[PDB]
């Protein structure tokens, strides 16, 4: 990250062994379940591109996923170099990725006025690649999630929203899915209660009504 | 590492017991699997040569690998003393290795303007030796990696890129390997799908196509 030096001006400070051990543990345990993206973004707060690259390099195994990540960052960086023309200099996409700049340039861009926040721009590209990975590691479509005849309605809500969180579809589709699919894919007992409530109920009303049903 | 003193000027601060315990754990567990190099470089950020030597000395066992490392650092340091003539003084290769200088000289060189970054120069030599070690501890050529008739295409991508990450070959050869060998060494079912895609597909397209094939 960047922090205030002895002179008060901002300077880089190393990503701690505890943060790296935490990230390594996160990816070793949770294997691109969607909470890995919030955990990455929380662990990587204020990170320079060198800190982001350090986190991603410490990932052991998962090398198919990490190649899907690198080809995404290539696609995002090429889009950046298509978007931004050529005239601190303006960073090229390879500079934002930390591939063609020093760390001193990254401190420069991140501390300029107005800032050129290469740490956040690059973290957006990494998170967009981690998204593509998480949706591919998700084994089921939201269309596949149904409640069993003997399954509690809370364990179906938990499976449904845990799957919905990993869907690609736009927020208009996720809204429609929560309203229509949550009613329709419940088992006939619970679905009868949810049809007696109707389309207008909140998730609290639907869960408290189907409690023990 | 080096950090700002009470006078604001840079001075050395000891490599913490948590960093040393982390490095000892890394080398005890992961035994020069390639992630040991990013872990070394992350744990060793801002390290003086005395800090680098302290990390390498704490490695228990692996003494064959550590001798391959010392003979590499000798080769790199001899190349440095061949490259740089004799006129802070300019550091000799033995000074960059921390073998023939005080720590005060290392702080001097690292805080001079322009810097003489003996901590990074030496960390390059150490990482280049850790590379030679990692490629020797890697048990299989990339030519040996093939998909089994009953093996999922993601577990073959994972084995392939985890092996490719430890190949010596130039990036032109690794590019050619990802394109040609990734198609050719797949099992005939998956390879049929990859030949139906052709040479142009991304790793995401190849994995999503061979999913459950």
């Amino acid at each position: 990250p960047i922090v205030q030096n002895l002179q008060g001006q901002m300077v880089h400070q190393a990503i701690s062994p505890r943060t790296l051990n935490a990230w390594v543990k996160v990816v070793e345990e949770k294997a691109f379940s969607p909470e890995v993206i919030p955990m990455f973004s929380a662990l990587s707060e204020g990170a320079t591109p060198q800190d982001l690259n350090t986190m991603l390099n410490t990932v052991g195994g998962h090398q198919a996923a990490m190649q899907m990540l690198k080809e995404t960052i290539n696609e995002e960086a090429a889009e950046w170099d298509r978007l931004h023309p050529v005239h601190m200099r303006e960073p090229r996409g390879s500079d934002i990725a930390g591939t063609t700049s020093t760390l001193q340039e990254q401190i420069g861009w991140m501390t300029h006025n107005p800032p050129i926040p290469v740490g956040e721009i690059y973290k957006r590209w990494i998170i967009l690649g981690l998204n593509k990975i998480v949706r591919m590691y998700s084994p089921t479509s939201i269309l596949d999630i149904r409640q069993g005849p003997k399954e509690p309605f809370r364990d179906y809500v938990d499976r449904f929203y845990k799957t919905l969180r990993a869907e690609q579809a736009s927020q208009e589709v996720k809204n429609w899915m929560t309203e229509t699919l949550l009613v329709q894919n419940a088992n006939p007992d619970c679905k009868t209660i949810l049809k007696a409530l109707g389309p207008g109920a909140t998730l609290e009303e639907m869960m408290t009504a189907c409690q023990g049903v | 590492p080096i950090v700002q003193n009470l006078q604001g000027q840079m001075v050395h601060q000891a490599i913490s017991p948590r960093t040393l315990n982390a490095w000892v754990k890394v080398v005890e567990e992961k035994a020069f699997s390639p992630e040991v190099i990013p872990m070394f470089s992350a744990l060793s950020e801002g390290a003086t040569p005395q800090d680098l030597n302290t990390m390498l000395n704490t490695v228990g066992g692996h003494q064959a690998a550590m001798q391959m490392l010392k003979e590499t650092i000798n080769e790199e340091a001899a190349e440095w003393d061949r490259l740089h003539p004799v006129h802070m003084r300019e550091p000799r290769g033995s000074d960059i290795a921390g073998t023939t200088s005080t720590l005060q000289e290392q702080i001097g060189w690292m805080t001079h303007n322009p810097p003489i970054p003996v901590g990074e120069i030496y960390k390059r030599w150490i990482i280049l030796g850790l590379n030679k070690i990692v490629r020797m501890y890697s048990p299989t050529s990339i030519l040996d990696i093939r998909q089994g008739p009953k093996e999922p295409f993601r577990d073959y991508v994972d084995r392939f890129y985890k092996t490719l990450r430890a190949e010596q070959a130039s990036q032109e050869v690794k590019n050619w390997m990802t394109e040609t060998l990734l198609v050719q060494n797949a099992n005939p079912d998956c390879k049929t799908i990859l030949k139906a895609l052709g040479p142009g597909a991304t790793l995401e397209e190849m994995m999503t196509a061979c999913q459950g094939v």
Partner: peptide
């Protein structure tokens, strides 16, 4: 592209 297939993140 900035990140080649066998290459670590951030390159050399």
């Amino acid at each position: 592209g900035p990140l080649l297939p066998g290459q670590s993140f951030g390159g050399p």
